[PDB]
Structure 1
Amino acid sequence: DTKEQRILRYVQQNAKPGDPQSVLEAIDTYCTQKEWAMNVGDAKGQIMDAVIREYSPSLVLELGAYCGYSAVRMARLLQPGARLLTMEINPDCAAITQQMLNFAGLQDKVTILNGASQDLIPQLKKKYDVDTLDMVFLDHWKDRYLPDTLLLEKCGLLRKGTVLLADNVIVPGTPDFLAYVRGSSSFECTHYSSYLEYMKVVDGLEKAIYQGP
């Protein structure tokens, strides 16, 4: 089996069904004690929680699900009826994420999409009946942060006040995205310094709030 399957089986055998906080704890314990993996992790997760609670978004788009850690983290804080759409290009990871969400009891809040962001973003309005997004969590290929931000805008998916929250802006890094949003009058940007998941390595989140054209 793969690392991702081992993480899912660990959660199934060490967390309580229907209890999202147990699922996050189990993932973080496994990835601290057994095998590192690219989940957002608890240090950066606690900053995500504070952002989610400040904005109480009704409709969130995540780019990059992986094993569903960030999807569990955000969906557990959504208000009743609020929704998360999460895009995952790797079908094995899409299947782990669906199973992780099932286990956590969050499957009615989340729709796990299996494809590439550049293919799926243009289908959001017609196929997933999206008007505009309240928040976007960027956690996919780091060289896609910037092009997908611009594609979201092209597609009319951003509105005044949509919150972009970007993982890994330091490690691995997203230098073009950072320079762009920080330089642009169309974004109001804040950096939250933290640590790479499970490591004593500096990383950070960027929040970039869209201000319209």
Structure 2
Amino acid sequence: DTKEQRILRYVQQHAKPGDPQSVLEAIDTYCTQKEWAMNVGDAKGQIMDEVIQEHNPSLVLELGAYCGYSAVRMARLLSPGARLLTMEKNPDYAAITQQMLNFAGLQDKVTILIGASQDLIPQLKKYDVDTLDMVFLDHWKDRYLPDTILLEECGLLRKGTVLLADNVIVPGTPDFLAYVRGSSSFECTHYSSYLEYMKVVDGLEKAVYKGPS
């Protein structure tokens, strides 16, 4: 059985149905235990929460999902009428994410889109998306830059749209950080989470779009 299947089984066995906090804790506990991800709730979850609270988005796009942790984390904060779109190419991960949201009682806040972002971002207009208020870029860091370009080119960003990208500790290729920092179209903030230690545990980049030039 896959890691993601085992994460779901553990939630099913230990978390309280319809309780997002219990789901998040159960995922966090099991992953920290297995040394798969260290205290995601403190390293990335709190930054996710504060960005969402700071900008109060009505429409969020999540690019990338694995076991549904991030989708639950975000959907649990959205106000009535606010919605999360979660786009993921791998149907197994999308299926776990769906079941995790069902278990948490958050399925009515989320639309899961299964497919490649190159195919689906240009079709977001068909989901009644004019522009996005926030984008969370997760897991597949080599997609961050090309996905950002596609969002720009499809007119899905407006002045004030917030991009938040996870796991940007080291430069990679394609280099998302160099693009958003270099461009005068994005105002950027870097977050480094150390937890109680001296070494970075997770790094995130917030890039706020200044509007089309």
Deviation (angstroms), 1:141: 2.3
Deviation (angstroms), 1:174: 6.0
Match of 2:180 in 1: 181
Distance across 2 between alignment mates of 1:143 and 1:47: 21
Deviation (angstroms), 1:35: 5.1
Deviation (angstroms), 1:2: 1.2
Deviation (angstroms), 1:38: 9.6
Of residues 189-198 and 175-184 in structure 1, the stretch that sits farther from structure 2 once superposed is 189-198
Counting aligned pairs with the same residue, the percent is: 94
8 Å contact 1:94–1:114 — kept in the other structure? yes
8 Å contact 1:43–1:194 — kept in the other structure? yes
Q: CA offsets, 1:134-182, max 9 Å, x none? A: 0000114222211111110100100000000000111584661101111
Match of 2:35 in 1: 35
Distance across 2 between alignment mates of 1:50 and 1:25: 18
Distance across 1 between alignment mates of 2:133 and 2:105: 23
Aligned CA distance change for structure 1 residues 203 and 37 (closer, same or farther; 3 Å): closer
Question: Over aligned residue pairs, what C-alpha RMSD do you find?
Answer: 2.4
Deviation (angstroms), 1:3: 1.2
**TM-score under structure 1 length normalisation:** 0.92
SS in structure 1 of the partner of residue 71 of structure 2: helix
Distance across 2 between alignment mates of 1:174 and 1:136: 20
Aligned CA distance change for structure 1 residues 172 and 100 (closer, same or farther; 3 Å): farther
Aligned CA distance change for structure 1 residues 28 and 140 (closer, same or farther; 3 Å): closer
Distance across 2 between alignment mates of 1:71 and 1:169: 19
8 Å contact 2:67–2:100 — kept in the other structure? yes
State the number of aligned residues: 212
Distance across 2 between alignment mates of 1:98 and 1:199: 36
Distance across 2 between alignment mates of 1:80 and 1:152: 25
8 Å contact 2:43–2:202 — kept in the other structure? no
Deviation (angstroms), 1:42: 3.4
**TM-score under structure 2 length normalisation:** 0.92
8 Å contact 2:139–2:167 — kept in the other structure? no
8 Å contact 1:39–1:67 — kept in the other structure? no
Deviation (angstroms), 1:205: 0.5
Aligned CA distance change for structure 1 residues 10 and 110 (closer, same or farther; 3 Å): same
SS in structure 1 of the partner of residue 158 of structure 2: coil
Match of 2:163 in 1: 164
Structure 1 unaligned spans of 5+: none
Match of 1:151 in 2: 150
Deviation (angstroms), 1:7: 0.4
Distance across 2 between alignment mates of 1:60 and 1:148: 15
Aligned CA distance change for structure 1 residues 80 and 86 (closer, same or farther; 3 Å): same
8 Å contact 2:169–2:200 — kept in the other structure? no
